[PDB]
Every structure is written in structure tokens, then in C-alpha cells.
UniProtKB/Swiss-Prot annotation:
Protein name per the record: DNA polymerase epsilon subunit B
Keyword match Transit peptide: no
Oligomer status and interactors: DNA polymerase epsilon is a heterotetramer consisting of POL2, DPB2, DPB3 and DPB4.
Gene that encodes it: DPB2
Organism, as annotated: Saccharomyces cerevisiae (strain ATCC 204508 / S288c) (Baker's yeast)
GO cellular component: cytoplasm; epsilon DNA polymerase complex; nuclear replication fork; nucleus
Chief location category: cytoplasm
Amino acid sequence: FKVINASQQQRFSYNPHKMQFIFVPFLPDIEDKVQMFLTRYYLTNDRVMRNENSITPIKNLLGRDAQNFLLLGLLNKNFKGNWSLEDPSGSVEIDISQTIPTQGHYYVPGCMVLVEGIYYSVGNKFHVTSMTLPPGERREITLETIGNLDLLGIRLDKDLKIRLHLLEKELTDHKFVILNLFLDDLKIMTALSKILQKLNDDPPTLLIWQGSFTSVPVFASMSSRNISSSTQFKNNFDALATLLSRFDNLTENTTMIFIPGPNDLTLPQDPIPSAFTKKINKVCKNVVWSSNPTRIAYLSQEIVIFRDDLSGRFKRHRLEETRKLVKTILDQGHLSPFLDSLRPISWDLDHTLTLCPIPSTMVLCDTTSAQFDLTYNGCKVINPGSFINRRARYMEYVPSSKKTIQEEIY
């Protein structure tokens, strides 16, 4: 039972002939960039093969001139209306002129989909019957076909220990606390005062401090107050550490986790530096600084935490709600199904963002949708929503019974 370090995690590469991963383990390489999407295509390929209306490459159809296939590819774009599609065997412009597809989750670019139709080589523009997304299977059969290795950290698989589930179903002593959170307002101080008031009595176990610790970003340019974004943020930490030290009931038996948001000093992202967490590391002894995103090494489960604006980007890019969002992220099996010219993902840690296999719980702290918790093929996906303008609301999750309770003060 630990917290997985993204900068210190392993790496696994897939082989289609052996259908398995190899012992892979500063700046990345070119091969990483190429094999990034290559690994994506072959992973989706094998994922399709696990589900056994046929299979055909682009070169097979372009070699002909007549027809009739459900092609696989990325909804990319070269020119206006020149929505091209690419597999590792050729490129082809596709059109959806007067198409009545299904009611998919959220069709977005940079996504590998399946479209049926005919070529019509006179203009060589493939037509679409219906656009569909690659289906995602349950975690049971998924973990059945992964093989016999370790994908979370313990190397083979030995999860046949009923004592794990029994002790978790009995030791209710380990509770998770989830609260956007700024630091330079009296309202924040008040909220934290009543929150810790609820926390000094009942000892929690794992604190999850969300991102966006400041209303403003970095890149300071005015030395009016003889300060900068760094110094201001440092003093904000000092104030938080002082309120934290006002009540020493905490850190006695509760572990904490910081998570950097989008406005602190491009994915993935290393945590808040030690130079700004010096005093809190001195006062406390149960601190950690995980990258965004990260995974909690839970003894029998795969919980992943990722804070970003998911709903705020899908609506600004569809061609022509909450379950649509969750359905999209789980079916594509990836956290950022977006082009690299849109969200620059670091070449080294693309595997970290990969949802191979299906995780147990994805903590998606959205900053533009309400708080919820729903199920979709088993993985209970949550959202705590905002924290201040929603009249001070927060969440508490039970891992054993998987209970989800909301707690509001106003």
C-alpha cells in the first residue's frame, strides 16, 4: 500500500506476435514519438481482436477502385472538409455528407473510430454510413487476458488473497477525504476551519488536496509589492502550514496527498517543488507529492486520480452528458484522446496516461460540471465539482463498501 510515483514508474511495451509486454526499463527519443501512436494503433487492434463487419487495411481498398468496408482510423484533418483518415497502410480523405450515425458519446478529433461505407474511387472519397467508437469490455475478462504479470506494483500476479478483501471489508479505519481550492481568501480560511473542525474529532486517513492553489498563475512582472508569484505562493504555503499547525491532531494518524493543478509553477507534470513545500515537510511526516495524474497503490484495486477540464473541451470540438464524458474516456482507453498538436503529451510517459487495463476508480475532478458518481461497466467514476461558489461542498468515499457521501455546511 503506497502511492505510485509517475517519475519512478515502470514501462511496458507490447509485442503483437507474442501479444505481450517486455522489461522496458532523461529527455525522450524520436522513436518514442513514432511508436506512441503506433502502440496506440496496435493496442486498439489487439483490443478489437479480443472481441473477435471484417478486417481490411487501407492499401487493400486503394489497390482496388470499386467495392464496402468499416474502416478504422483517426478523425484527423488536413484541410476544410478534408477530414483524412490514417492507418499504418495509407491515407484517405473521408466524407460524412448526409450521414445518420449512432448517438455516440462525444465524437472528437484525434480519436480512432470505425466508419462503414464505400470507396467510390472516381473522386476517391470514402463515404460514411455510421460513425462508431471501439467498445470497451469489463475489467474481469480484461484482467483475464492480460497475462500473468504486475501492472500496479508488487514479477507475476498473485491476487488470490481473500484476506485483502476481508480486511478491507472489516478495517473501516482507512477513509479518503476529497474537497479547486485557493489560498489567499478569508472564506477559504473559514471553510478550512470548519472542515478541520470536522476532522479533529474523527481521524481521517488519506487527504486529497486538489489543484489550483492560487487564483492567479505564475509569470510575475510587477515588483510593486516587492514580491513575485513564487514568493506570494510561498507565503500562501506558510499560511496554510500555520493553520495546519494550529491543530496538531492531524498528522498524528492521517496521511496526506498534494495534487498540482493547472495554475502552479502539457501532460504529465511533476509536483510542487520542495523549495515551496519546505515548511510543510518540516511540520508534517505523512506527506507526498504525486504527479498529475497518479495512481494510488491500493492493495486490491486500481484507483487513478486526474484533475483537468474534461467537459470544457469536448463541447468546443464536436463535428456536427456526464455519461457521454465517462463513456468516451473509458471506450478510448485513454485520458487525452487528442492530437499532439493540441495537447502536447510528453513522449516518455505516454504509458502513464494509458488506461491499460480498466482501472477501479478514476477521480475526475471537473471544474465545469456538477459533483456526481456513476457506474459504467463497473468502474465507479466520480466528480467532486467546485468547492467555493457551490456553498462549501465536499466528498467522502468508502473503498470497501464503495460508499459515496456528500457533505455540505451551507
